[PDB]
Amino acid sequence: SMNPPPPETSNPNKPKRQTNQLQYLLRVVLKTLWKHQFAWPFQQPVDAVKLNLPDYYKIIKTPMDMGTIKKRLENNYYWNAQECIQDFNTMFTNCYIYNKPGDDIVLMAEALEKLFLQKINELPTEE
């Protein structure tokens, strides 16, 4: 029922880069999803205590959220675009695992994921 430590956003001995694709992931993809009317549940780690979801971190063992992704992008935490794309996909998948079809939170994730897919479709060639 207690909250775990959040995913790391800093790690000096992890190799990292700022590729043009990673720049697009921050300036286009994250920016588009972050400003959306449905972004708010995804802007920080799930607080299982305040939300009274004591089973959340029993079911979701690889948590991810856009607050973490934002900090990772701002901190140049990633080596490549695939790592960041995986974080977005983990975030959406976690929501679909924990919740059920038609739940408000699932409808919100679906709207954000549609925009994610539209933006990823125009990911530039590396570089």
UniProtKB/Swiss-Prot annotation:
Changes after translation: Phosphorylation by CK2 disrupt the intramolecular binding between the bromo domain 2 and the NPS region and promotes binding between the NPS and the BID regions, leading to activate the protein and promote binding to acetylated histones. In absence of phosphorylation, BRD4 does not localize to p53/TP53 target gene promoters, phosphorylation promoting recruitment to p53/TP53 target promoters.
Residues in Bromo domain copies: 17-123
Cross-link Glycyl lysine isopeptide (Lys-Gly) (interchain with G-Cter in SUMO2): residue positions: 58
Marked site: Acetylated histone binding: 99
Tissue expression as described in the entry: Ubiquitously expressed.
Localization per Swiss-Prot or TrEMBL: Nucleus; Chromosome
Subunit structure: Interacts with p53/TP53; the interaction is direct. Interacts (via CTD region) with CDK9 and CCNT1, acting as an associated component of P-TEFb complex. Interacts with RELA (when acetylated at 'Lys-310'). Interacts (via NET domain) with NSD3, CHD4, BICRA and ATAD5. The interaction with BICRA bridges BRD4 to the GBAF complex. Interacts (via NET domain) with JMJD6 (via JmjC and N-terminal domains); the interaction is stronger in presence of ssRNA and recruits JMJD6 on distal enhancers. Interacts with NSD3. Interacts with NIPBL. (Microbial infection) Interacts with bovine papillomavirus type 1 regulatory protein E2. This interactions may serve for the tethering of viral genomes to host mitotic chromosomes allowing successful partitioning of the viral genome during cell division.
Record: disease: Cornelia de Lange syndrome 6: A form of Cornelia de Lange syndrome, a clinically heterogeneous developmental disorder associated with malformations affecting multiple systems. It is characterized by facial dysmorphisms, abnormal hands and feet, growth delay, cognitive retardation, hirsutism, gastroesophageal dysfunction and cardiac, ophthalmologic and genitourinary anomalies. CDLS6 inheritance is autosomal dominant.
Free-text comment about domains: The NET domain mediates interaction with a number of chromatin proteins involved in transcription regulation (NSD3, JMJD6, CHD4, GLTSCR1 and ATAD5).
Purpose of the protein: Chromatin reader protein that recognizes and binds acetylated histones and plays a key role in transmission of epigenetic memory across cell divisions and transcription regulation. Remains associated with acetylated chromatin throughout the entire cell cycle and provides epigenetic memory for postmitotic G1 gene transcription by preserving acetylated chromatin status and maintaining high-order chromatin structure. During interphase, plays a key role in regulating the transcription of signal-inducible genes by associating with the P-TEFb complex and recruiting it to promoters.
Further comment: JQ1, a thieno-triazolo-1,4-diazepine derivative, and I-BET, a benzodiazepine derivative, have been tested on tumors with success. Treatment with GSK1210151A (I-BET151, a I-BET derivative) has strong effets on mixed lineage leukemia and promotes myeloid differentiation and leukemia stem-cell depletion.
Family: Belongs to the BET family.
Name this protein carries in UniProt: Bromodomain-containing protein 4
Organism per entry: Homo sapiens (Human)
From-to range in the entire protein, with total length: 44 to 168 of 1362
